[PDB]
Design a protein around this nucleic acid. Structure first.
Lengths: 367, 367
RNA sequence: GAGCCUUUAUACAGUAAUGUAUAUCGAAAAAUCCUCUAAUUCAGGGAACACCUAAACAUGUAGGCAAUCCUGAGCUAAGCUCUGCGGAAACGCAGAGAAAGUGCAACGACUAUUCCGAUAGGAAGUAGGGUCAAGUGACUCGAAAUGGGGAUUACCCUUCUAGGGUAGUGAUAUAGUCUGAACAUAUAUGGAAACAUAUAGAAGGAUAGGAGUAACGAACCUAUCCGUAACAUAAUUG
RNA sequence: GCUU
């Protein structure tokens, strides 16, 4: 139909792009991730990954365990590179763990929570867009974002399906041997069949997104590597055992590049020692009635000049080009901290919109 | 309603019989069990299972995975006691693993494979019922038999629920400490996620049966012992997990009577140090066009002059009483196989009808 | 809406009327009698209405409800066919089967009566219920095959008096009695909701016992769980 | 033409 018409039209567009990158005419979204520091580890030839990106209009996602009734800054890290991918035209999504929470990542009223979170996420996009169009970005039809909920399928997802479609492929070996969890049995109480299986699901999720949305990438927590790997395995397993001949033409690991890869953003902390996201005790929440807009503006303007550089490139949607401009201005007057007042205002916008974020500057820049 | 009064009828009688055992008048089903040597191991108190069988028309089943196109003579023994219970007036079942086959018990097309067994169990049951009334057995309203496919439910069993309804109380520790496993990892190969779950499955199955009919007792192969244990585990957590309380009022283990016990038949192997089912050129099946009636008949007519005894108790619904009589004629002439004919015939007749029982004996009676 | 037959069309089927198949159609229908009504459970899969809901997903969907199409296990009244024994006959017993019914009523419970009528129904007051009394009393309702099996009939066909075929679905509840069914409810689990399931609802109600009986019942005695919030209400609906 |  006419719908398929625009689809193929997009392919070409994405090729003029794949071209520019070929002759370094435009940076590779991947080398963009290296330019702001979003790469800690990689489950997929750092290089390969790159090509897979310059080339195809791939997709990715970021999962969030709806355990808290609000996300905190610590989640903003991994969502950034996603966002960027979005700004380029890829297919990005944010998977909510509505069901997974019920088990929880064994790394080491529930509705009410799950609910809030959803909305909390859409809001961001609502701003990422406003931001995207504003900071000078072009309208791409094919471009694709969205919010999913692992429950959507897991709620009825029969076990026979899973246990068979992949159960024969995995082996408790590189599972029970997994340090993160294995360590839990030794140095801990132990583990519930749920926990042991949690990964397995995290992998059925990745696949679901591939099978249901063409996802060849997953961005996650620094500690989520051990998971991103195990997921992978599960991903493929299903693609392999596709008992459908006409559907094998899809899912089955065709071309070499047709491989799902991922990358764990780095684990950050404050110039001192306190882990990132936490503050004295709790954390830098996002929920206004739990972290006033002011306080928010605070933990950001707080960061000293030692990190402002590395952390400025991490949480702002600003061309490193213009970044060094703000930084080169700040360094000629560290005391006044022009760079700290700006970086803070910038991130408060994205999450809390300009209108407020601007007023919030008045408070903290007053007296 | 009338139907109501009916269930009550059989109920009352059950107490009359509960008394006979209480005042020595009829062997408690379970005594007839350990007596005819059907028992080798037990999960629950020897007296526990006793009392329960005195005051409860409990339900019990025998699991059978359709991995082969025919039930081999081995599958008899385990079923045998079951049949007896049906005879005494219980709730007995035979479970078909039409889905668990893609997994199988770990220890060390296919669609029709199952079909074959279906038709089987049936026809068999028929004769069981047949011989029953055939020999002074008064039917009972409450006495019921039946077969049930395991896919019956697995076909669409929600992963989420399951995992929760029991995973939150199961540790992969002891679940992996079962030797059956440790070996299937150290020695030999490895243990997949799938097969790892078989123990849980067979456990759930039980739960089902306990729910859909009132089956609170498993009867498995001499080796299936472990499963009988790992299974019972899932069983408990299940009756607890039940969300709606009102239901819990029934489904949850209230008094010590609502205790589900399971026992395992012995390991019966021929005087050939080989399972009593993996002998001959490969095995000894029931399928006529896979094991000549004659050849079958033989498997019995020829057996240890000593074995006859305990072999009659295990494969013939012959009253202990005249069972010894057969031993009277036999000993007057060891090499005459007087008892071997009677014990051989029984088996054939049971799994092949009287008409054949004779026809076979004839061939095995020539010059 | 859906099914039945029905108009016509083709199609595989036959000795042929006719048979099965899809679609179209509606122009008149759609024989009688007798006998059986037991079992009444455990799941499973699908579904027209446009019929409520709208949390997701980009009105499209989706979940619910549902006329209702079925499958597995078990069970079942009188017959049915194969084989074995009995018989003179019947039928009997045995086993192998082949229909068919529960399952598959508005959540269910319960019953297969006479008379008259072209029917709808009318009269009986049986079957079996409801209410009040307390005792074997009053009062008030009040009735089904539309299936299974066996006959008879008429019909036309005929490889033409001997076979063959045609004489509709309707019971996933029909009659009818009840009714926790009916509540946009209360409650509790499950859902975002619509809902589904379980109790309960004009302080009582429910089940399991004690006693006592000729037996059931009223009333007593024990325990138990439900409410103790307003509606349940009378037509009316399966 | 009838039917739940």
């Amino acid at each position: 139909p006419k719908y398929t018409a625009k689809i193929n039209e997009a392919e070409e567009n994405w090729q003029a792009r794949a071209e520019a990158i070929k002759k370094g005419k435009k940076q590779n979204t991947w080398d963009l991730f290296e330019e702001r520091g979003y790469v800690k580890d990689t489950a997929g030839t750092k290089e390969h990954i790159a090509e897979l990106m310059r080339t195809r209009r791939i997709g990715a996602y970021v999962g969030i365990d709806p355990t808290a009734p609000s996300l905190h800054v610590g989640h903003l890290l991994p969502l950034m590179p996603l966002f960027w991918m979005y700004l380029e035209g890829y297919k990005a999504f944010t998977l909510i763990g509505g069901s997974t929470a019920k088990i929880g990542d064994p790394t080491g009223d529930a509705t009410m929570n799950m609910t809030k979170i959803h909305y909390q996420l859409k809001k961001l996009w609502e701003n990422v867009d406003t931001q995207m169009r504003a900071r000078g970005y072009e309208a791409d039809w094919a471009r694709k974002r969205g919010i999913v909920n692992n429950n959507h399928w897991w709620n009825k997802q029969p076990m026979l399906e899973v246990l068979r479609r992949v159960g024969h492929a995995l082996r408790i070996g590189p599972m029970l041997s997994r340090d993160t969890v294995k360590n839990k049995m030794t140095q801990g109480d132990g583990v519930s069949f749920a926990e042991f299986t949690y990964p397995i699901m995290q992998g059925w999720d990745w696949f679901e997104l591939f099978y249901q949305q063409g996802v060849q990438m997953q961005i996650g927590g620094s500690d989520q590597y051990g998971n991103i790997i195990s997921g992978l395995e599960v991903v493929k397993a299903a693609r392999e055992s596709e008992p459908d001949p006409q559907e094998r033409k899809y899912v089955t690991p065709k071309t070499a590049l047709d491989e799902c890869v991922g990358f764990t953003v780095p684990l950050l902390t404050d110039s001192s020692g306190a882990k990132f996201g936490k503050s004295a005790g709790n954390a830098i929440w996002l929920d206004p009635y739990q972290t006033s807009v002011f306080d928010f503006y605070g933990y950001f303007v707080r960061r000293s000049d030692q990190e402002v550089e590395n952390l400025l490139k991490l949480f702002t949607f600003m061309p490193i080009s213009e970044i060094t401009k703000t930084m080169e201005e700040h360094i000629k007057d560290p005391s006044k901290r022009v760079a700290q007042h700006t970086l803070a205002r910038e991130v408060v916008t994205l999450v809390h919109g300009k209108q407020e974020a601007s007023a919030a500057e008045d408070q903290h820049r007053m007296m």
